[PDB]
Symmetry: D2
């Protein structure tokens, strides 16, 4: 059984490597994400949530991810440098896995997103007229700095800052919310993730998980992909959710 | 086949009779909701969403409800007097039904709520210290005027005014949100409606769908019941939601 | 020179007496607010902002107030038990005074409010239809749990929880904001404090600084009074503002 | 008495020309704003609030402005095509003036802003770390898509969409609010326009009234300038505000 250790800075890589060693696991260190990662039994992320997002941009089929939070808040991580040994041991031996859906939009067919797909204007300080449709029905048209289509996992990211609700990890759904909407009233919409999202806009740009982006004009489609992000089951995922959220910043 | 027609004011009760008559349906009239409605094939509600809420408070087993919106906005209704005869026939003929979960708290053992269970302070202009727990884990503790535990159907009611998100009718869940929270940061939480909610508060009052209340001191649990609200299927429920919401007043 | 010392609990009332001693000031201890306080050169509040709100309720003319916060946050206080001495001496010796307007409403002529005048429904969990006029012009009609009319000082109290903006102490103005407004869109309005505020509501109750209330039906008017609250000049009032607000709860 | 008529389209230029001729006012046509407008007794704007903003960009000394609204909502406007002839005559005959402050940025020494000075990220979908100080005191530090420093006039513009409050036209003040702030809690701040604002951020751009922008790295300061925007007094500005704000989109 071999595993890949991905890291941003040399942080705690030494000890993490030795721990995987004592658990008799072959190790291969990575300076940065690479599609080569698909060829392992599981991955150990060392950094933050951003690290895990970058790792997932290289994966289609996804081996179990165990994340180590090196910073402040880690909604996607399993432990910190302080207790990764105990947890890693439990994860690597119990080998219970857990899945969360990933999305894709027609403008970038090969990209998958865990947090969200954002439609922003190309120039800063410029609005865009965005039309929104889901399962064919026109649900709204609004002028804003951009529009967010996020998963429940994304509810704590960009959507959160736009004023969105925090949604439980285990409740699948889309969160449609505008960024700086110019209208008297507006509300975030929470709909089923089985539905098809269509966003219509001119002189815009699509961004997925803040990584890959492509300029586009007209209309794009967003739906649930077939390749979820996979992690080892975090027994306290729900419990930690509320505490981690109050410390965001 | 027999149907009970419940009305707020006897303004159209005649036309409706001469319509259920044409459809060969035995008809009975009730000026005020009653446990007897439980002995009919279906119920016709004349008035507003409130009318429907008042009817439900009398039903454990719930015959299919066909609502005729008397006024402005009716998220729970099926048509207005301007076209009820048409939509009524399609409903009675196809007889396709739809169900939405109802909840109950321990303070009032036999009452069901379609919108929410709200916990407010007994005296106006006075705060209460509220503690929240779902499935055992402590999720929050905050000072506020009150706290709402709503279903997705209630996401457009009291919860909406407290700044909650608009949630699709076909996505089951709990919107947990405070009313006038006295704290720098706060967010609504959307969790699976399969979980157990617990609200701990002193000098408080519990209200179900705005109909039945009762004072309580301490803990009360809220959870999904076995007796849903049953309505005739509304083929356009999803599309008409966004429109009706923007006109809420 | 004699000064009154008001306290809720026996907290640090001792050392505070001994400090006013070394400053050659005559002391008079009060277990609770009294209209008597008007006959002093200055008052020393020992408790919190609530304590100061309760003291001001019994003062038409207001001798300089010096607050000591034994609580968590005190936007109206000058020091904590840890440094009241140094600050008390500076205040009493330099004796520089600062003033903030107080408001009064027609329903309760003799009452003055430093934070706000709030219009709430008599029964909890019930909305009230509120009409708002400023200087005779109609500004808004809305359904809500209540409606707040606050000063810049109250901007961090009830109005804050209703979603209002924090206004610095030295910018005189009114903050009009509803509690749980039942409407798609709504915004807090910030108008000049020289204007006449008019609130029309049935089955309501008016409250001033959360201390005095009167049931009322019809229309009440609110405007700037002639008896400001008077405190010793607080040099760091402004810079302290932003830190104290983030800790509110 | 000579006046310049600035228009965005051939619209009602003809009828406006006869209207002024019929008033013994010498007129001149301008397709696009010019620094020459400073050489007229008054200016007639045809278009929307944007037209007015673009005209102000070329004026230090500001001759009175009369606005005719082509669009749907014009908070800076005076009349619509349907009745400009009437209002125009009352304006030009009474010649009553009204002034509103414009602020200036240190990154663009000669530009004036009526709505706001906004600091945004250079790249879309990228946050910037923004530090805020007013009158030399540290007020906040937050990660966001941007930050807005608006005047009461701008409170209905960008600040509005960022979730800021509605501040009446006659209450001079600054509105400090972030765009898509990534933090659990946050509040818009309203401070006196006599204070000095300082925004600190790297890899950012400053935009004035959404017209002129420059890249900056470090610290910029914003203060009230000496060159106000001037308009013919709008008798119903205060009452029309609430109506216009509720129709924004
Ligand atoms: N709020 C905003 O203004 C804003 C702007 C752009 C992008 N974003 C979010 O960040 C992602 C793209 O990031 P980026 O490459 O531009 O920069 P980062 O990834 O440089 O910035 C994103 C920040 O958000 C944290 N984060 C990411 N996903 C999160 C989640 N689900 N819940 C809570 N925090 C989360 C990151 O992890 P840390 O613990 O690991 O460091 C980091 O602090 C998007 O998926 C989007 O959700 C937010
Ligand atoms: N926003 C608030 O401040 C507030 C305060 C108390 C109660 N409520 C809500 O009203 C219910 C209690 O009713 P009540 O006897 O006090 O007064 P009503 O029932 O007198 O008032 C409730 C108002 O909300 C509308 N409504 C009801 N259920 C709704 C839903 N699921 N989505 C959108 N609108 C809905 C009703 O419409 P119809 O008659 O008009 O057609 C009615 O206009 C609760 O379930 C709660 O959700 C809201
Ligand atoms: N946010 C809400 O939901 C809510 C509900 C009702 C009343 N209030 C406010 O409470 C006051 C009525 O007093 P009460 O007898 O009901 O309660 P308290 O005064 O029993 O409770 C009020 C709480 O608010 C704090 N507070 C008071 N004035 C403040 C101000 N100007 N800025 C920031 N915090 C302030 C108090 O601080 P200390 O701990 O220092 O006393 C206390 O924690 C009114 O001024 C009203 O604005 C707020
Ligand atoms: N909310 C947002 O996302 C956003 C984004 C960028 C800029 N803005 C605002 O627009 C200005 C820059 O203009 P721009 O070149 O980007 O495009 P515009 O000027 O093309 O767009 C601005 C829109 O806002 C309206 N507007 C302008 N000033 C206003 C004010 N003081 N109060 C209420 N509405 C106002 C305009 O009205 P008319 O159609 O009648 O001219 C127009 O619809 C800035 O001063 C800023 O306040 C807002």
């Amino acid at each position: 059984m071999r595993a890949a250790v991905v890291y941003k800075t040399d942080g705690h890589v030494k000890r993490i490597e030795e721990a995987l060693k004592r658990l008799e696991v072959e190790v291969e260190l990575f300076n940065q994400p690479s599609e080569e990662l698909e060829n392992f039994d599981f991955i150990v992320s060392v950094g933050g949530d951003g690290t895990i997002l970058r790792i997932l941009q290289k994966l289609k089929r996804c081996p179990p991810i165990f994340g180590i939070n090196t910073g402040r808040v880690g909604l996607l991580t399993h432990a910190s440098p302080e207790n990764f040994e105990v947890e890693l041991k439990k994860a690597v031996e119990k080998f219970e896995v857990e899945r969360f859906p990933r999305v894709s939009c027609s403008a970038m067919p090969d990209v998958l997103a865990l947090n969200e797909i954002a439609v922003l204007s190309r120039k800063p300080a410029k609005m865009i007229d965005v039309a929104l449709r889901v399962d064919g029905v026109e649900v709204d048209r609004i002028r804003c700095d951009g529009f967010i289509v996020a998963t429940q996992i994304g509810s704590t990211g960009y959507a959160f800052s736009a004023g969105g609700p925090v949604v439980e990890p285990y409740l699948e759904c889309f969160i449609l919310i505008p960024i700086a909407p110019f209208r008297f009233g507006w509300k975030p919409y929470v709909v089923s993730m089985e539905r098809k999202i269509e966003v219509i806009a001119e002189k815009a740009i699509v961004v997925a998980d803040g990584q890959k982006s492509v300029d586009f004009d007209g209309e794009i489609t967003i739906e649930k992909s077939e390749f979820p992000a996979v992690f080892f089951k975090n027994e306290k995922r729900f419990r930690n959710l509320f505490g981690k959220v109050r410390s965001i910043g």
